C-alpha cells in the first residue's frame with residue numbers, strides 16, 4: 200500500500216501535523232495519542248511492514264488489525280464526551296510513553312500537550328478524524344484481511 | 345484474597361511526605377469533575393464511609409481555564425481558608441462550567457458575596473498570607489503527586505485513585521465501590 204501511504208505521507212500526513220501549528224493551535228492530550236495511533240502507521244507500514252520490500256504484508260495486516268483500531272476509539276472515546284461527559288473520566292494536560300520509550304522529550308516541539316477546555320468544515324476537529332480513523336480502517340481491512 | 349494494585353487503586357512510584365490523608369483534585373472546568381462531584385457527590389460518599397473523622401481535603405487545579413483558573417484557584421484558596429467551601433462549591437461549578445456566566449475575579453467575587461461571604465472580607469483574606477500560602481501549596485501539592493488529570497485522589501500521599509478497576513456501568517454501585525476503596529487504603 201506504499202502508494203496510498205506515500206501520498207498519505209506526502210499528501211495526508213502533515214495536512215495534519217502542519218495545518219494546526221500552521222495557525223499555531225494548542226493540542227489536547229488525546230490529540231497526540233491520536234497523532235501517535237497515526238504517525239505510528241504512516242511510518243509503521245512505510246518503513247514498517249508493507250516495508251522496504253513488498254512480498255509479505257500480513258505483518259502490516261496486524262499493524263492495521265490493531266493500530267488503526269486504537270486510532271478508532273482514541274478518536275471515538277475522545278469524541279464521545281463532547282456534550283456527553285462522564286464521571287469516572289479525567290481531562291489532562293500532561294501525557295505519557297510507558298516502555299521507558301519517551302515521546303515527549305524526543306521531539307519537544309510536536310510530542311507535547313497543553314490541556315484546555317474553532318470549527319473544521321461542517322464539523323470540528325475530532326469527529327472529522329473518525330472520518331478517517333474509521334475510514335482508513337474498513338476500506339483497508341476489506342482488501343487485506 | 346481481593347484488593348488489587350493497578351486495579352482499584354494504583355500506588356505511587358515517588359511518594360510524598362506531609363501529604364494530606366485523602367486529597368481529591370479537581371477543576372471547575374472538567375465536565376467530569378462536575379460529574380464527579382456535582383452529579384455523584386462522590387466526595388460526600390467517600391466522607392461517609394470514611395474512617396475515624398478523617399482529613400477529607402480537596403484541592404483545585406490551574407491548567408484548565410488558563411488565566412481564570414488561576415484566580416478560581418485563589419478564590420478557592422480563600423474558600424478553604426475561611427471557609428465556606430460547601431457554600432461556594434456548588435455555585436462556582438454551576439457558574440463557570442454549566443451556564444458560562446463567570447468572566448473573572450469579580451464574577452467569582454460576586455458568587456462569594458452572593459453566597460454569604462462578606463463583600464470584601466473575601467478580599468480581606470484573598471491577599472492574606474494565609475491564602476498565598478494556601479494557593480502555592482496546592483500547586484506544590486499537585487506537582488508532588490505528579491499530576492496530569494482531574495478528578496484525582498490520593499490516600500495519605502501514597503495511592504493514586506484508579507476509578508477503573510471498578511464497575512463502570514452501574515452508578516449507585518461504582519460510588520460505594522469508589523467510597524469503599526478509601527476506607528481500605530486509609531487504615532493501611
Ligand SMILES: COC1=C(OC)C(=O)C(CC=C(C)C)=C(C)C1=O
Nearest residue numbers: 215219224225226227230233234324
Ligand atoms: C481536538 O484537538 C486536536 C488537535 O488540535 C490542535 C490536533 O491538532 C490533532 C492532530 C490533528 C490531526 C488532523 C491528526 C488532534 C488529533 C486533536 O484531537
Ligand SMILES: [Zn+2]
Nearest residue numbers: 382383384385
Ligand atoms: Zn445531586
